[PDB]
Every structure is written in C-alpha cells, then in structure tokens.
Amino acid sequence: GSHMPVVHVIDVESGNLQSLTNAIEHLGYEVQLVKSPKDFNISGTSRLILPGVGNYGHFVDNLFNRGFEKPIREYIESGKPIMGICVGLQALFAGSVESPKSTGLNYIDFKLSRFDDSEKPVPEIGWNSCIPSENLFFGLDPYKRYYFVHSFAAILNSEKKKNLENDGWKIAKAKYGSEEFIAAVNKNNIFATQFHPEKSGKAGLNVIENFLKQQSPPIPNYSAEEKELLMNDYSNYGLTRRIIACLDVRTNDQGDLVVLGKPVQLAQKYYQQGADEVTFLNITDCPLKDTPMLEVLKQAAKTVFVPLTVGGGIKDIVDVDGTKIPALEVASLYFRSGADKVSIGTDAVYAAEKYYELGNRGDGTSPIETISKAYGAQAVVISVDPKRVYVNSQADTKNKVFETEYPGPNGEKYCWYQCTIKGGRESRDLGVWELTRACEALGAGEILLNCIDKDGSNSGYDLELIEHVKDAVKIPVIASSGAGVPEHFEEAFLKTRADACLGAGMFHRGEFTVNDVKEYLLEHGLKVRMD
C-alpha cells in the first residue's frame, strides 16, 4: 500500500493484462487495478497507465461507459504521469475509421486510419523501429525493436507532423512499407506508445521503467559498425524476420502436462534464447475455469515478455456443468490468462465452406468473425493443414490450381492443396487458396501455414506452397513445417514472401536455439530482433 511505489492500471477487463501487470511488478512496483472510477482518486495516484486492445469503439465505449472520461481528464490536468498503450494511445485522438461513430479524448485532432494493404500485409504484426531523431523520449532507441500488432494507426504526412510540432507534441515515428506513422507521443505529462512495451522483451521493459521513473536515458554510443547492423533497412516493409518457437502441450498417463512446469520452462527457455513469439499447441472432465493449459499461459506470462499464441480448444464448448460457452468467451478466457493470439483450426474450414455456401458472405456466427470483431483481426490466426494433390489440368477440379515446377507421378504439371481437419485425420474438398481467402474475408489476421508432407521432415519448407498462399491473401503468412536448420529460415526469407518462420522440434531437441538461427540470418544480411 505504501511499501513500494504503486502504479494504477485502468482495466476495462478485456484482453491480456497479465503481461503488463507482471512487467510492472517485475520492475519492483505494486500494481493497482482500476476497474471502476471508484477504484482511484486523483491526488492518490502518481502513475497511471491506460492499456487497450481490440476494436477502437469497443474499447472507448467500454471506457467512457464505466465513467472514466472525467477522471482521466482530471488526472491529466494534474500534471502527473500517464502512459497509454496501443488502443490506449489511439484513445487520445479524435477517433478512428475503425469505428466511424466513436469519439476519442481528442488531445490530437485527427483520426486513426487503416494501413494501405495494396503494398503490404495488414495488420502490421512484428518488430519495427523508431526512426532516428533528436526529439526521442523515455529511452526509445532506434537501434532496438518493439512489437507492433495493429491494422489502424496515426498515419503521418508533412502537414500533420508540423501541426503536432507547433502544437508542442514530441513524436516518435516509424515506417511500415511506404507509410510513416506514430510509434509514440509525448507532450508534458502525456506519454503513449502504439507498440506493446510489455511484449517487447527487455527493450520494452526499459521503456516501461523509464516512464515509471520519468527519465529519458541517452541512447547507447553504438559504433558506426553496430548502427549499420542494427538499423532498419526497410526490407520486409521494415519488420525484422520473425522467428517463432512452437511447442506441444499434452496430458500424459498421470494427468500431468508434458511436451505442469515442463511447457512453462521450455517457453521460458525459448524466450531466453531469443524467440520473438512462443506458440503453444494445446493437445489436451475438467471445468473450463480449471483447464491446465490456462495455468501454463499464466505461469509463462510471469517472465516471458513476448507474444504468446495458443492453438487448440478455442471453439464453442459445453462446460462440465452443461453451460454453453461460445468460442468468443473461451478465447476471452485464454486472453485474460496470458494469451495474445488464438489459433483456429477445424472450425476455420467449416467457416470457409459456409462462407462460399452463403455466396461469399459471413453470417457473423463463426469463431473467426466473433473473436476478430471484438479483439481485432490481429488476435486471430488460422492454422491450415494442407497437402498437395496433382491433376492434369485446372479442369479436373473446381478449386484453384497453379503450375508447379515439380511434375506429379504421371507428369501432372498442376496441383492444388487440399485442406484437412481434426488434426489432419479428415480431408475436405476445399483448396488452401479458397480456405485462406474465405478466412481472411471473415476477419482472420494471420495464416499459420503448416504442410502435412513436410511436417517432421527437417528438410525445409514447401516453397511453392508459401508463394501460392501469398498469392491468395493479403494478411501475414507464417512458414511452418519442415524447418530443421538455420538455412531453411534463410531460404524462406530470401526465396519466398513468407512473413515469419516457425520452428518446433529443432528448438525442442536442442539441435539449435533461436539465437543460432538469428546469428546465421544476421550473418547473411537479414534483420532480426536481438535483445
């Protein structure tokens, strides 16, 4: 209560708040959750944080309905420190095209707009950097990386930058593709970040620390050599080559969780060895509230400060007491437990099939539509399990096919990828081309592209499959299945338009660490997060 400095965090009770509070306590502070305006008073609050995720209107409505507008404004007028995160920062603007009818606190008189997806994938999911400038603040370092996950942003141009300057605002800029946007803002006692510091490893913790301590450390004296190596060259739109570490979560004979301190320690190890993200593949008469996978996330979230994804089990379920819990709420539970993204599998295929059946339209009942409308496309990833099928010509199937470089058994020069469901035990008559385009239309923000035929092989990724999917959709595509050695990552990043690469057994077996891969990619002129 007064034995350590207390930090007040406004909680609209939606999304992952585990990481932020764990980050604050890790820094030696006591967290005080404010769910109601009654939970805090101006004079007794010295450090306030406004975190937010998901749909703009969804967040701001929740915020002002609970009665936080006046309290927030009064706190700001007192001159005391406030920090906004993600939607917390966008809540400072006039509003957002994302939610046409929503109004913001309007400290910055323009609205957030969506990134241009004709030249790059949207949402932006990855590690971007702050453009070098004389007016940076709170230790933001151009040579370090921060994690961004959003579709909308305060996109800048010459006029807006000048107006902000004359307005007395200090801006930390970033660029994704050809678009320049606001990475962070600072004016008097207001500080806000578009990226998630609690998801940005050590670099992120530093930013939270500098804010809590009200300090703007000078950036390290990097050698011209180090700068040229750590600087953003705007390859891959300005995002580093994202390396994901994946692990399975099973229930053994005795009922314990295995690959509950095993899945937890391995995720910690992955994190410590440089993983940019940790994905848990959940393959498990237990009540939803007591699902052991949820404890794994919660425990992992105490020290792993990078995004966490969980696949498997995120669907409509009937609890032990017969309660009907829809996908959306099951997801909310994993999110509040430490998860940042949820991977949909089998349902994705059903949803896509229905989509085409309805004449290429969604009816809003799929887990993809519900979770994404609440948390944003960035919170939903589609796990696809496809396998190559050869045909003599586009005429042998209704699905989209492409001319392959590797002829089939009978000399077939064309093929399509047939999707499966239920852990790849059952195939459907839907190509990966159609599955991904439908899911994207339904609101998915990213594709986790597995490949049955390469899975477990350790001989590299199916390169034509990656290109086939990149031709189909505009959302980020993750290369999965086949990774064995660092060179496989190099090949995907240089020979294909893959937006990220996932590795499983190679990291689990200790053959290579994420750092080994990063060191190798780094040695080959690729940009990678190093923290």
The catalytic site residues sit at 86, 196, 198, 248, 385
To the question of whether residue 189 is assigned a binding role by annotation, the answer is no
Tokens of 316: 């409509």
| 313 annotated as belonging to a binding site for a ligand | yes
The answer to whether 221 contacts Ni ion (rule: CB under 5 A) is no
Q: How far is the CB of 28 from Ni ion (least distance, A)?
A: 12
Residue 32 or 450 having the CB closest to Ni ion: 32
Per-residue x/- marks for Ni ion, 1-30, CB under 5 A?
Answer: xxx---------------------------
- Residue 168, CA distances (Å) to 77, 91, 107, 161, 190 in order: 16, 19, 11, 11, 11
Q: Which residue's entry shows tokens 């703009």?
A: 56
Nearer to Ni ion, 31 or 333 (CB): 31
Residues 366-395 binding Ni ion (CB under 5 A) are none
State the DSSP code for 122: S
Q: What are phi and psi of 514, to 5 degrees?
A: -65, -35
Smallest separation (angstroms) from Ni ion to the CB of 37:
23
Write the DSSP symbol of residue 383: E
Q: Which is nearer to Ni ion, 29 or 146 (CB)?
A: 29
DSSP secondary structure letter of residue 272: H
* Shortest reach from residue 46's CB to Ni ion, in Å: 13
CB of 80 to Ni ion, least distance (A): 19
Cα torsion 416, 419, 420, 424: sign: positive
3-state secondary structure of 32: strand
CA–CA separation, 161 and 18 (whole Å): 34
Nearer to Ni ion, 28 or 217 (CB): 28
Round to whole Å and give the CA distance between 526 and 383: 26
Nearer to Ni ion, 30 or 319 (CB): 30
The nearest distance, CB 4 to Ni ion, in angstroms, is 5
Please give the size of the binding site for Ni ion, defined by CB under 5 A. 3
Q: Which is nearer to Ni ion, 212 or 452 (CB)?
A: 212
DSSP 151-181: SEE-B--HHHHHHHHHTT-EEEEEEETTEEE
DSSP 44: G
Q: Please answer whether residues 443 and 473 qualify as being in contact, where contact means their C-beta atoms are separated by less than 8 angstroms.
A: no
Q: Which of residues 394-413 bind Ni ion (CB under 5 A)?
A: none
Comparing every residue's Cβ against Ni ion, the nearest one is: 3
Binding residue per annotation — 62? no
Closest CA to 192 of 50, 20, 95, 54: 50
Single-letter amino acid, residue 420: T
Question: Both tokens of residue 31?
Answer: 């967290």
Judge whether 250 and 281 are in contact, CB under 8 Å. Answer: no
Give me the sign of the Cα torsion angle 45, 305, 378, 290: negative
Question: Nearest distance from residue 310's CB to Ni ion, in Å?
Answer: 34
Would you list which residues are annotated within the binding site? Answer: 86, 313, 450
Contacting residues toward Ni ion, per CB under 5 A? 1-3
Would you list which residues are annotated within the binding site for L-glutamine? Answer: 86
Would you list which residues are annotated within the binding site for substrate? Answer: 313, 450
